[PDB]
Amino acid sequence: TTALVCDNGSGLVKAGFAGDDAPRAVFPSIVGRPRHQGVMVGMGQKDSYVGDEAQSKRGILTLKYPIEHGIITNWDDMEKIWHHTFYNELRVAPEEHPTLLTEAPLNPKANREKMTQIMFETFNVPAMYVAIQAVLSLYASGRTTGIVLDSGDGVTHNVPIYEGYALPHAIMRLDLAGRDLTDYLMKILTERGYSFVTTAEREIVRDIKEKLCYVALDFENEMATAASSSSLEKSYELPDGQVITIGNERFRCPETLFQPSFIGMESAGIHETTYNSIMKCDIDIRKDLYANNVLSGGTTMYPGIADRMQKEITALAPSTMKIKIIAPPERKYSVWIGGSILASLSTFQQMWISKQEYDEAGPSIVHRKCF
Amino acid sequence: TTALVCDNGSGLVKAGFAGDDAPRAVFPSIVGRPRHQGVMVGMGQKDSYVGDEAQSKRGILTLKYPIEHGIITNWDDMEKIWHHTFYNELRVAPEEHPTLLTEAPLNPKANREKMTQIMFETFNVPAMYVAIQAVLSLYASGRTTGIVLDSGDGVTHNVPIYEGYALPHAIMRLDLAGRDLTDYLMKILTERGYSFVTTAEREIVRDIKEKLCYVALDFENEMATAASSSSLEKSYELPDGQVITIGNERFRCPETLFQPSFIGMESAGIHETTYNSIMKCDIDIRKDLYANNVLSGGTTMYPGIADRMQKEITALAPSTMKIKIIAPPERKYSVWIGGSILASLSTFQQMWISKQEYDEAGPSIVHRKCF
């Protein structure tokens, strides 16, 4: 039979059968209970709208993501999300399909063990396998080397790989991602008068960020230009009218990636954690990693980031090496495409964690040889 | 049929059919298992890369030479190296070709006996013969007398020969060679800030030594000059950028040959063990040995050694004798060229150790008349 390539993510759940080009169903991972009282009788009001249904009734819900930073903080809601994904968005019972979840690097063990225990006890799948979210993104590019920066919505991690041999001592995981950029944008919009507070209006700020923000090639020059002319002010129409005008908030929101001091984080930007991740590698594979830097994940879709990052790394790196940044147009679904490719391989067909194996060793089987 | 003139050496395996000018395939003798984990499936990752393949993937391997000082310390790896040499670099099955290995003087017997046992049982050659590495280097020079200093990469030995009669009581074998010079260079580079530790970076230090180091004609004057001017500082680009500048480390690394007290060895340099080897000979053949001093082996390729050695010996020797140092441009492959010449001789064709002879007397046949 065919395998189910699910990809929990944090912000958008992407799923679909193995062997295709794009995920079959992509929908936000939010579960929102209603918060008001409700007076109409017999309206058929449910107790929790999940997935894309709660992005249409969000006016009277309190949306809450079940995955904070890669890790899962609310297991009941995550189980509800998985149940919805299997039964309503794909309509395939899990009793007859292997599953291939994905997990960020350096995550707590208990999260992974609970994930496999749920998949084997509640949904009762035949066999499931958990894979690191960066190796798949490297599969999708058709490479076999390269250092991949997978800046998702929950957590940004940077896994270097050479000739198929991952370097476990050079993984640099940073917890700045799309959600913190949404919060920072929502916080700097208040400097013009627009106040978004409700958890429903966070979605509106996210839409503003997606449609308007861009990464500046040079920060100081853009700050000077936006403060003199008015060629940058782009307007946007809220879900009820009252258009708003975003000035130099456009390139200040995604600039947080390269200067995490804006949101008070100490660490260095995504332009310098990649160079540090390279320098921890051996001295003889640094040229190949320099030449095959891969971008993935949703948050790396800002217009103009593949040039800013290249300029920064070229500034840091030695002058002789060639710096090349692979930015495929299908960046958002790169991890899932790689997952489909991996699940479609014949050599991989014996790596699944078969159910009888789980019955013999318990949920701690995932840390064992079947990784 | 044609004979296979293999030459194990220590650092570079040189092989080729008898009767040519240069070895057909020359490649480092290193076998490196991968050391990291490896996440890509189906990449076709082998368990041990040998020869020149492991000098390209050395970034994720742990290279380890199977021959320490002439002697062989790891027989399985040496068997792997031989198998590679026969089947992939020459592509001739050994069942139809005599072999002519080479061995340093004064080596343990068990090494030679195990070598012949392997060649007769595993590879199943028709007949093999083991020859001393210095007599061949004397063949290649077209001489018949002379004292040859064969400073390889494993061990430096100094065999005097007159009129074809070797003098077994005058062989002076010293264990300082190219590998110790590489280690000493890697140890003195730390005085400027460059630290090379990994077994892969030993190859980089070896490349630095080959391309930059030279032997000073007079040591104290060079030490004084390099400490005042800056006309010696030559720069070199690492495999990733970050050029380095070598100062008076240039002529201090190969100076260890003439002053083995630098690496803590007690014995006298290669300039004085040759004179001692001569003085042990009879009083009537010392003039001929003085006039026909032969250099061979890789490590004698330093620019300016054929003058320093001549100056030193002229200082030691009596003033009347003429001191001449033969330094052919084809020094590195001198032993193998001599091996080809010896294997191509008709008079030598009945000295091979035929397989039936080995079957009758066991591996101890090599010490017998068939030397």
């Binding site: 050599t347 790596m351 040889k369 079947c370 | 984990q37 499936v41």
Partner: peptide
């Protein structure tokens, strides 16, 4: 015990 990937053969840079 880390997951040791079993013995495969290919492929790369073609399905892409």
């Amino acid at each position: 015990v880390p997951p040791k990937i079993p013995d495969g053969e290919r492929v790369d840079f073609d399905d892409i």
